[PDB]
Each structure stands twice: as structure tokens, then as C-alpha cells.
Amino acid sequence: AKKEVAIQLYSVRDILNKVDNKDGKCDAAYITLLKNLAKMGYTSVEAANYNNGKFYDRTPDQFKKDVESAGLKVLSSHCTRGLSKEELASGDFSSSLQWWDQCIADHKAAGMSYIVAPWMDVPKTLKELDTYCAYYNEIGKRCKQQGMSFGYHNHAHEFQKVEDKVMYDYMIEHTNPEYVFFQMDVYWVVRGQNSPVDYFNKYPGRFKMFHIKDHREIGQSGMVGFDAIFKNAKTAGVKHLVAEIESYSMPVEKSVEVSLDYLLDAPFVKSSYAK
């Protein structure tokens, strides 16, 4: 069964952390990995390495060619830059936006459709969280001006309160839906004691990507109600699914492949969310 599913490359970090694309080289193990991921049936990647204008020590144009030639789309990337104490205090985030301009140019050239902040710290005050919301709106606008969408990926910590407000809820309510979506990591929502579906119903259309992760292999633990999540996918607004596997019951590549196979065999997972 062919379905659109991205792989978060963090899932294969054990291979990718050791590949040597420095000093003009292209590591055959890097290319082989990409080709194997396509052969498993992944349709696209989400990067988890962006540093010094490069993805896994490849220029954006190289990364594009590498991924596309393996039969994969360049879908998304996890990267962000936090605000300085200064920026937070002044609310002036010019400095940080300059970095984003370079980040965004690089992502565009790699053929990315999305850029997603993986993490932010729980701030001390709602005022700080507010500044972050404004910064994300502006990053998101710049992404759109360069053909891409910006989103925010959660763990569990966002379900805590800042002053007396749940951080996640506040972030959703104070970001412009045109410019910021939420890449809901459903596993982490459940770990954070919350209901993916209730979030979908309360903020329909904001969850344009899912991170589909589990305790180990996807769909194995009993810890994530994928069936209910997918049944409510229309309300969520999801357009792409990103599989992530960071902890394993078996060899990594095999783990990543059986994880996919869960989604391909699941009758409630449609073959595309972007038709």
C-alpha cells in the first residue's frame, strides 16, 4: 500500500552522525541510507541537521539532489534559534531574524516546504511567551515570503502552565494561523497527559503536520491512540505525516521500516493528506 509518510532523519541519527561529507566528500553510507529509506516506502524526509549553511555537511542544493535522486521529497526540517535575554527584554529580535533569513534561504534552496522549530524552553512569564509568539509570527511570514510554512513542534513540557495559562494553548491562541502551524507530536501530547483529539476540536486546522512517534516502534506500545487521531485528521488540518523512531526493539533500519509498515497497514491512515 503506497502512502505519503516522511521520515524524521533523527530516527537514523546513529548512521548519520558518523557519515563524513566533509572536505568535498559524499559518504556512500549517507546515499545508501537515503536510498534504503525510499525502498522501505518513505516518500519524503524531515531533516534534523542544519548547521553552517549545510544539511549533514551538504549544501542545500546538494541535499536536494541527494534526497531527490534517492526517490524522496525534501519535505521539512527541524531547526530553530532561541531569543537572547536581551531580545526578550527589549522585544527586538532583529538579530535573530537575520539568522532566520539565512536559514530560510537555505531551506528554500533545498526544496523544503516546511521549517519547524523542534523545541523551545518553558519561559518564566507570559510576557516572554508572548514575545516568542511574535517572533514565530515574523519567522513564519518570512518563510511564506520564501515559499514555505513555519511550524512549531511540541514535547510534553508545553502542557505545563506559565503564570496560570497552559503554554501550548497560549502559543496556539497568540500566533497567526497563516504563519505558524503546530506540528503536533501526538506521542508527547499523550505523555503530557492530554488529548490530541481535544486539541484538534478546540483549534481546528492548526495542526498541519503530525509527528507520528511511539515509545519504540510506531504503533507497538499501546501508548498512542492513532486510530482516534487519524479518524479526526480532517479537523486537525493535517497535510503531512512525519514518522519518528528514536528508541528501538531491533536494528535501527528494521525498526524504522516496521514503524512505517504499521502506518501502511493501518486502514485509518489515508494514502495522502495533501490531495
Ligand X SMILES: O=C1[C@H](O)CO[C@@H](CO)[C@@H]1O
Give the footprint of ligand X on this chain (CB under 6 A).
8, 10, 48, 78, 118-119, 153, 213, 244, 246
- Verify binding: residue 196, its own copies, rule CB under 8 A: yes
**Contact of residue 89 among ligand X, Co ion, its own copies, none (CB under 5-8 Å per partner type):** none
Candidates 146, 191, 248, 252; binder of its own copies (CB under 8 A) is 191
**CB of 100 or CB of 182, closer to its own copies:** 182
**Contact of residue 10 among its own copies, Co ion, ligand X, none (CB under 5-8 Å per partner type):** ligand X
Whether 55 and 47 have beta carbons less than 8 Å apart is answered as: yes
For residues 160 to 199, the per-residue mask of contacts with Co ion, x marking binding by CB under 5 A and - elsewhere, is: -------------------------x--------------
Nine-digit cell string for 11: 530516527
Residues present in the chain in total: 275
**CB of 123 or CB of 192, closer to its own copies:** 192
Give the containing element (helix H, strand E) for 150. strand 149-153
For residues 203 to 222, the per-residue mask of contacts with Co ion, x marking binding by CB under 5 A and - elsewhere, is: --------x-x---------
Phi-psi region of 183 (alpha: psi -120 to 50; beta: other; left: phi over 0): beta
Kindly give, in sequence order, each residue whose CB lies less than 8 Å from that of residue 155, ignoring residues fewer than 6 positions away. Answer: 119, 185, 188, 192
The torsion angles phi and psi of 232, rounded to 5 degrees, stand at -95, 20
Q: What is the DSSP annotation of 213-259?
A: --SSSTT-SS---HHHHHHTHHHHT--EEEE---S-SS-HHHHHHHH
**CB of 47 or CB of 148, closer to ligand X:** 47
**Contact of residue 223 among ligand X, its own copies, Co ion, none (CB under 5-8 Å per partner type):** its own copies
| Cβ-based burial of 257 (10 A; exposed 0-12, middle 13-18, buried ≥19) | buried
Which residues sit at the interface with its own copies, rule CB under 8 A? 186, 189-191, 193-198, 214-215, 219-229, 232, 266
